[PDB]
Amino acid sequence: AECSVDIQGNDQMQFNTNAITVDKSCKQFTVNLSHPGNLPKNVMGHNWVLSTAADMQGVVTDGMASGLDKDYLKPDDSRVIAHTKLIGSGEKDSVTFDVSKLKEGEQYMFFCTFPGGSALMKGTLTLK
């Protein structure tokens, strides 16, 4: 199954992968985010958020400053290329987005925007 990827965030602040490759010839791409482990959303929440490498920092800072009610994202943060809901243990969220929103030779980062000082629940994303 190209044009999708299953990804997990555990009670350890770990994504089960840190490099996503998106196939140049997908019209759309889907991220299937789950949470094993036993910790609730308010303690060990994870979302999967996509931005350019450059924007990641800003998106995170403004995101944490948005609070739990906003899934730790700034409302209408135009830097956020795509994102899932914030999930807790045993929950499950998907996000599909147009691959046309991605550009060749750019660094993208995926990450979780839930609080933790110097991080980071992060990973790279890239076309191919």
Add this chain to the structure above:
Amino acid sequence: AECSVDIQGNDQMQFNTNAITVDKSCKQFTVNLSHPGNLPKNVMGHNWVLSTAADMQGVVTDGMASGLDKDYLKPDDSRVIAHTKLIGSGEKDSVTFDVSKLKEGEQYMFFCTFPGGSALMKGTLTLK
């Protein structure tokens, strides 16, 4: 056993108590901190740290800005009345301090200074 208290911080960011009362007639007071649950120091670290209510904020901010090597405390933070080591799952640390360092009618706060989730692992402590 007055003049001491056993206190736990779990994989949930929860101290097992949030109000400590120090007996006016103890010469010294002892806090026995332990960590049930399974998560390592670098994920779910807990220390027990005591300051005035006033100082708590600055101590926490400068503490998180100190990093894991410094047990998330500012070196020689003179606002820190007493503190334990930072511990992970299965670990155990105690701290004794002079009750003379406490003053009647003042709000004191105990807290973990590890970089948090939704809000802070707080509690109160009072002379009586």
